[PDB]
Design a protein around this nucleic acid. Structure first.
Ligand SMILES: [Zn+2]
Ligand SMILES: [Zn+2]
Lengths: 87, 86
DNA sequence: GCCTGCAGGC
DNA sequence: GCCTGCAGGC
């Protein structure tokens, strides 16, 4: 993907939130900023807790198109994302 | 503590202790379970379903002797039950 | 228990 | 691409 953001249920409980530094629990809703790596080719996620993600400031107009993995979310979470972005 | 286990193969890496060929992921496989003296916990010796019977393993009552039996799909439950009889 | 293949994190 | 955890084999 070439999108700037990603959302998904945490594939493990091992990722740390770039903002608050705590672990992001398996299966919890997490969002990433996708960044290029200097050490190799490929994009790499910077993960945040859902709430942590929004605190750090974001002008996401249409979550459905800008955020990779939006469609694979449970419906009510797709809403939680829209309501939050629009806020 | 049952002596046998049956399940759909969790991976494709296990090798049949009768014929030596690999046991394909999700295929129906059977094990005799053995206690390890190197660590607490049982080691399974896996077989392709058919190979299991060709080495002299024997089961009268699958339901009770074979761990995992009742989570098999129905037709596989019947296959095991009949093969055991035969 | 040890190994290994690979998924997840970075 | 490097590191590590871990599931799955034995
Ligand atoms: Zn956080
Ligand atoms: Zn075999």
């Amino acid at each position: 993907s070439d999108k700037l953001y990603r959302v998904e249920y945490a594939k493990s409980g091992r990722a740390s939130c770039k903002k608050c530094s705590e672990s992001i629990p398996k299966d919890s809703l997490r969002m990433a900023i996708m960044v290029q790596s200097p050490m190799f080719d490929g994009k790499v996620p910077h993960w945040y807790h859902f709430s942590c993600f929004w605190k750090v400031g974001h002008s996401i107009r249409h979550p459905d198109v800008e955020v990779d993995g939006f469609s694979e979310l449970r419906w009510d979470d797709q809403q939680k994302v829209k309501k939050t972005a629009e806020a």
